mmCIF file of C-alpha atoms in Angstrom:
data_model
loop_
_atom_site.group_PDB
_atom_site.id
_atom_site.type_symbol
_atom_site.label_atom_id
_atom_site.label_comp_id
_atom_site.label_asym_id
_atom_site.label_seq_id
_atom_site.Cartn_x
_atom_site.Cartn_y
_atom_site.Cartn_z
ATOM 1 C CA UNK Y 1 1.646 -65.397 6.664
ATOM 2 C CA UNK Y 2 3.360 -63.279 3.993
ATOM 3 C CA UNK Y 3 1.639 -59.839 4.004
ATOM 4 C CA UNK Y 4 0.894 -59.843 0.464
ATOM 5 C CA UNK Y 5 -0.803 -63.222 -1.548
ATOM 6 C CA UNK Y 6 0.233 -63.634 -5.118
ATOM 7 C CA UNK Y 7 -2.198 -63.929 -7.562
ATOM 8 C CA UNK Y 8 -0.475 -66.225 -10.001
ATOM 9 C CA UNK Y 9 -1.217 -66.642 -13.667
ATOM 10 C CA UNK Y 10 0.984 -69.674 -15.851
ATOM 11 C CA UNK Y 11 1.534 -69.731 -19.342
ATOM 12 C CA UNK Y 12 3.409 -72.003 -21.791
ATOM 13 C CA UNK Y 13 5.062 -71.888 -24.690
ATOM 14 C CA UNK Y 14 7.318 -74.578 -26.623
ATOM 15 C CA UNK Y 15 10.021 -73.248 -28.550
ATOM 16 C CA UNK Y 16 11.904 -70.055 -28.006
ATOM 17 C CA UNK Y 17 12.033 -66.890 -29.884
ATOM 18 C CA UNK Y 18 13.084 -63.287 -29.561
ATOM 19 C CA UNK Y 19 9.369 -62.432 -31.227
ATOM 20 C CA UNK Y 20 7.303 -64.953 -29.554
ATOM 21 C CA UNK Y 21 8.595 -64.376 -26.263
ATOM 22 C CA UNK Y 22 8.498 -60.654 -26.403
ATOM 23 C CA UNK Y 23 5.156 -60.428 -27.883
ATOM 24 C CA UNK Y 24 3.666 -62.849 -25.312
ATOM 25 C CA UNK Y 25 5.072 -61.466 -22.318
ATOM 26 C CA UNK Y 26 3.851 -57.781 -23.450
ATOM 27 C CA UNK Y 27 0.712 -60.169 -24.195
ATOM 28 C CA UNK Y 28 0.305 -60.816 -20.783
ATOM 29 C CA UNK Y 29 1.333 -57.266 -19.448
ATOM 30 C CA UNK Y 30 -2.120 -56.111 -21.078
ATOM 31 C CA UNK Y 31 -4.155 -54.051 -18.574
ATOM 32 C CA UNK Y 32 -2.820 -56.873 -16.050
ATOM 33 C CA UNK Y 33 -0.710 -54.963 -14.312
ATOM 34 C CA UNK Y 34 2.291 -57.645 -13.415
ATOM 35 C CA UNK Y 35 4.553 -56.575 -11.067
ATOM 36 C CA UNK Y 36 6.769 -59.911 -11.463
ATOM 37 C CA UNK Y 37 7.839 -62.517 -13.584
ATOM 38 C CA UNK Y 38 9.857 -65.954 -13.707
ATOM 39 C CA UNK Y 39 11.075 -67.564 -16.817
ATOM 40 C CA UNK Y 40 12.354 -70.861 -17.216
ATOM 41 C CA UNK Y 41 13.150 -73.329 -20.014
ATOM 42 C CA UNK Y 42 14.084 -76.675 -21.569
ATOM 43 C CA UNK Y 43 16.617 -75.134 -23.603
ATOM 44 C CA UNK Y 44 20.279 -75.080 -24.044
ATOM 45 C CA UNK Y 45 20.116 -71.596 -25.475
ATOM 46 C CA UNK Y 46 22.713 -68.761 -24.218
ATOM 47 C CA UNK Y 47 21.019 -65.508 -25.682
ATOM 48 C CA UNK Y 48 17.213 -66.106 -23.920
ATOM 49 C CA UNK Y 49 17.925 -64.520 -20.550
ATOM 50 C CA UNK Y 50 19.544 -60.942 -22.147
ATOM 51 C CA UNK Y 51 16.053 -60.570 -23.912
ATOM 52 C CA UNK Y 52 14.061 -61.541 -21.313
ATOM 53 C CA UNK Y 53 16.462 -58.845 -19.527
ATOM 54 C CA UNK Y 54 16.313 -56.465 -22.410
ATOM 55 C CA UNK Y 55 12.391 -56.337 -21.887
ATOM 56 C CA UNK Z 1 16.816 -67.697 -62.614
ATOM 57 C CA UNK Z 2 16.613 -64.710 -61.077
ATOM 58 C CA UNK Z 3 17.358 -64.543 -57.431
ATOM 59 C CA UNK Z 4 15.535 -61.863 -54.954
ATOM 60 C CA UNK Z 5 17.971 -61.202 -52.006
ATOM 61 C CA UNK Z 6 16.598 -58.840 -49.542
ATOM 62 C CA UNK Z 7 17.912 -56.123 -47.684
ATOM 63 C CA UNK Z 8 16.657 -54.292 -44.593
ATOM 64 C CA UNK Z 9 16.730 -50.934 -43.108
ATOM 65 C CA UNK Z 10 15.285 -48.521 -40.506
ATOM 66 C CA UNK Z 11 15.495 -44.777 -41.651
ATOM 67 C CA UNK Z 12 14.246 -41.787 -40.708
ATOM 68 C CA UNK Z 13 12.033 -40.812 -43.484
ATOM 69 C CA UNK Z 14 10.088 -42.414 -46.256
ATOM 70 C CA UNK Z 15 11.843 -39.858 -48.829
ATOM 71 C CA UNK Z 16 15.020 -41.539 -47.413
ATOM 72 C CA UNK Z 17 13.499 -45.044 -47.932
ATOM 73 C CA UNK Z 18 12.934 -44.181 -51.217
ATOM 74 C CA UNK Z 19 16.534 -42.916 -51.492
ATOM 75 C CA UNK Z 20 17.505 -46.384 -50.262
ATOM 76 C CA UNK Z 21 15.220 -48.286 -53.044
ATOM 77 C CA UNK Z 22 16.964 -46.181 -55.452
ATOM 78 C CA UNK Z 23 20.310 -47.282 -54.452
ATOM 79 C CA UNK Z 24 19.548 -50.563 -54.160
ATOM 80 C CA UNK Z 25 18.132 -50.453 -58.089
ATOM 81 C CA UNK Z 26 21.847 -48.696 -59.168
ATOM 82 C CA UNK Z 27 23.104 -52.269 -57.399
ATOM 83 C CA UNK Z 28 21.189 -54.045 -59.194
ATOM 84 C CA UNK Z 29 21.427 -52.542 -62.542
ATOM 85 C CA UNK Z 30 25.507 -51.865 -62.453
ATOM 86 C CA UNK Z 31 25.957 -55.567 -61.594
ATOM 87 C CA UNK Z 32 24.954 -58.561 -63.124
ATOM 88 C CA UNK Z 33 21.100 -59.340 -62.398
ATOM 89 C CA UNK Z 34 20.968 -62.393 -64.754
ATOM 90 C CA UNK Z 35 22.866 -64.278 -61.526
ATOM 91 C CA UNK Z 36 21.553 -62.499 -58.813
ATOM 92 C CA UNK Z 37 19.122 -59.657 -57.438
ATOM 93 C CA UNK Z 38 18.959 -57.725 -54.471
ATOM 94 C CA UNK Z 39 15.583 -55.988 -53.680
ATOM 95 C CA UNK Z 40 14.855 -53.294 -50.358
ATOM 96 C CA UNK Z 41 12.731 -53.670 -47.582
ATOM 97 C CA UNK Z 42 12.335 -50.688 -44.666
ATOM 98 C CA UNK Z 43 11.107 -49.053 -42.111
ATOM 99 C CA UNK Z 44 10.440 -45.788 -40.410
ATOM 100 C CA UNK Z 45 11.441 -45.500 -36.692
ATOM 101 C CA UNK Z 46 9.238 -46.698 -33.978
ATOM 102 C CA UNK Z 47 8.468 -44.909 -31.079
ATOM 103 C CA UNK Z 48 9.966 -47.505 -28.545
ATOM 104 C CA UNK Z 49 12.616 -50.010 -28.813
ATOM 105 C CA UNK Z 50 10.186 -53.011 -28.738
ATOM 106 C CA UNK Z 51 7.852 -51.680 -31.616
ATOM 107 C CA UNK Z 52 10.833 -51.430 -33.616
ATOM 108 C CA UNK Z 53 12.569 -54.795 -32.578
ATOM 109 C CA UNK Z 54 8.870 -56.403 -33.582
ATOM 110 C CA UNK Z 55 9.388 -54.904 -36.641
ATOM 111 C CA UNK Z 56 12.633 -56.486 -37.544
ATOM 112 C CA UNK Z 57 11.206 -59.885 -36.324
ATOM 113 C CA UNK Z 58 8.038 -59.203 -38.269
ATOM 114 C CA UNK Z 59 8.441 -56.608 -41.272
ATOM 115 C CA UNK Z 60 11.714 -57.329 -41.700
ATOM 116 C CA UNK Z 61 13.255 -60.914 -41.002
ATOM 117 C CA UNK Z 62 9.974 -62.236 -42.718
ATOM 118 C CA UNK Z 63 11.623 -60.770 -45.843
ATOM 119 C CA UNK Z 64 14.734 -62.897 -45.024
ATOM 120 C CA UNK Z 65 17.195 -59.737 -44.936
ATOM 121 C CA UNK Z 66 20.945 -60.718 -45.531
ATOM 122 C CA UNK Z 67 21.836 -57.771 -43.677
ATOM 123 C CA UNK Z 68 19.924 -54.322 -41.761
ATOM 124 C CA UNK Z 69 20.695 -50.650 -42.364
ATOM 125 C CA UNK Z 70 20.110 -48.438 -39.489
ATOM 126 C CA UNK Z 71 20.005 -44.727 -38.834
ATOM 127 C CA UNK Z 72 19.933 -42.315 -36.139
ATOM 128 C CA UNK Z 73 15.769 -40.834 -35.796
ATOM 129 C CA UNK Z 74 14.675 -37.014 -36.080
ATOM 130 C CA UNK Z 75 14.161 -36.621 -32.247
ATOM 131 C CA UNK J 1 26.601 -77.325 -12.642
ATOM 132 C CA UNK J 2 23.358 -76.682 -10.761
ATOM 133 C CA UNK J 3 21.742 -79.970 -9.748
ATOM 134 C CA UNK J 4 18.432 -81.245 -10.827
ATOM 135 C CA UNK J 5 18.519 -84.344 -8.684
ATOM 136 C CA UNK J 6 18.577 -82.080 -5.199
ATOM 137 C CA UNK J 7 15.524 -79.981 -5.945
ATOM 138 C CA UNK J 8 13.324 -80.239 -9.055
ATOM 139 C CA UNK J 9 12.461 -77.281 -11.094
ATOM 140 C CA UNK J 10 9.202 -77.001 -9.242
ATOM 141 C CA UNK J 11 10.935 -76.043 -6.376
ATOM 142 C CA UNK J 12 12.987 -74.032 -8.426
ATOM 143 C CA UNK J 13 10.057 -71.992 -9.452
ATOM 144 C CA UNK J 14 8.607 -71.969 -5.699
ATOM 145 C CA UNK J 15 12.041 -70.085 -4.965
ATOM 146 C CA UNK J 16 11.480 -67.515 -7.507
ATOM 147 C CA UNK J 17 7.648 -67.133 -6.327
ATOM 148 C CA UNK J 18 8.929 -66.516 -3.219
ATOM 149 C CA UNK J 19 11.676 -64.316 -3.581
ATOM 150 C CA UNK J 20 9.334 -61.777 -5.471
ATOM 151 C CA UNK J 21 6.729 -61.685 -2.425
ATOM 152 C CA UNK J 22 9.280 -61.412 0.118
ATOM 153 C CA UNK J 23 10.935 -59.007 -1.651
ATOM 154 C CA UNK J 24 7.187 -57.440 -1.990
ATOM 155 C CA UNK J 25 6.749 -58.035 1.612
ATOM 156 C CA UNK J 26 9.943 -56.162 3.020
ATOM 157 C CA UNK J 27 8.823 -53.290 0.865
ATOM 158 C CA UNK J 28 5.429 -53.235 2.256
ATOM 159 C CA UNK J 29 7.081 -53.254 5.639
ATOM 160 C CA UNK J 30 9.136 -50.432 4.823
ATOM 161 C CA UNK J 31 6.742 -48.033 3.254
ATOM 162 C CA UNK J 32 3.517 -50.056 3.702
ATOM 163 C CA UNK J 33 3.204 -49.374 -0.576
ATOM 164 C CA UNK J 34 1.768 -51.570 -2.794
ATOM 165 C CA UNK J 35 4.318 -52.783 -5.770
ATOM 166 C CA UNK J 36 1.839 -53.368 -8.086
ATOM 167 C CA UNK J 37 2.295 -51.475 -11.472
ATOM 168 C CA UNK J 38 1.058 -51.319 -14.830
ATOM 169 C CA UNK J 39 2.535 -53.788 -16.804
ATOM 170 C CA UNK J 40 1.849 -53.041 -20.627
ATOM 171 C CA UNK J 41 5.209 -52.001 -22.413
ATOM 172 C CA UNK J 42 3.885 -50.526 -25.766
ATOM 173 C CA UNK J 43 2.916 -47.511 -23.702
ATOM 174 C CA UNK J 44 5.454 -44.981 -21.864
ATOM 175 C CA UNK J 45 6.351 -46.731 -18.626
ATOM 176 C CA UNK J 46 3.677 -46.589 -15.575
ATOM 177 C CA UNK J 47 4.572 -43.132 -13.430
ATOM 178 C CA UNK J 48 6.120 -43.897 -9.878
ATOM 179 C CA UNK J 49 7.663 -47.130 -11.536
ATOM 180 C CA UNK J 50 10.485 -45.258 -11.685
ATOM 181 C CA UNK J 51 10.700 -45.271 -7.814
ATOM 182 C CA UNK J 52 10.704 -49.249 -8.478
ATOM 183 C CA UNK J 53 14.548 -48.702 -8.263
ATOM 184 C CA UNK J 54 14.550 -49.151 -4.292
ATOM 185 C CA UNK J 55 12.841 -52.860 -5.010
#
């Protein structure tokens, strides 16, 4: 019922890196023009949030 | 045996990169080269933050830098 | 800590998607305007993305 319907592209990556994450998220950006991102991890790592925040 | 210990930097211009490498070589010459050697790597400032961070992870850290130097860009 | 048992990770992701699309729906209701924006990081941020603050 919500006025906008979601179009979703899902991708997974195995282990976290500043380079891997930055590259991939920008890569998904492409011309694609995504207006939102949700991130999730199996990891215990503190740092990750800040990185995505930087993006 | 020598061991090459990399250093890395981001600087305003290629001339300053040459200055960097020169200073590094002065450091190598004047301290024991038998035990250890220092190697220099550097890159010009990139237009966004992201190209540069990618540069650090790719262009610099792939060289195993023990430290990085940074300078304010021309503009 | 947050509990895994109460709600599993996909339920949580559903919450995230729901938040993004609900924000999109409310922003729509207010300005009748598409939130969609050019995603590419490498170039300058797309115009009218500066407008995004209200989101």
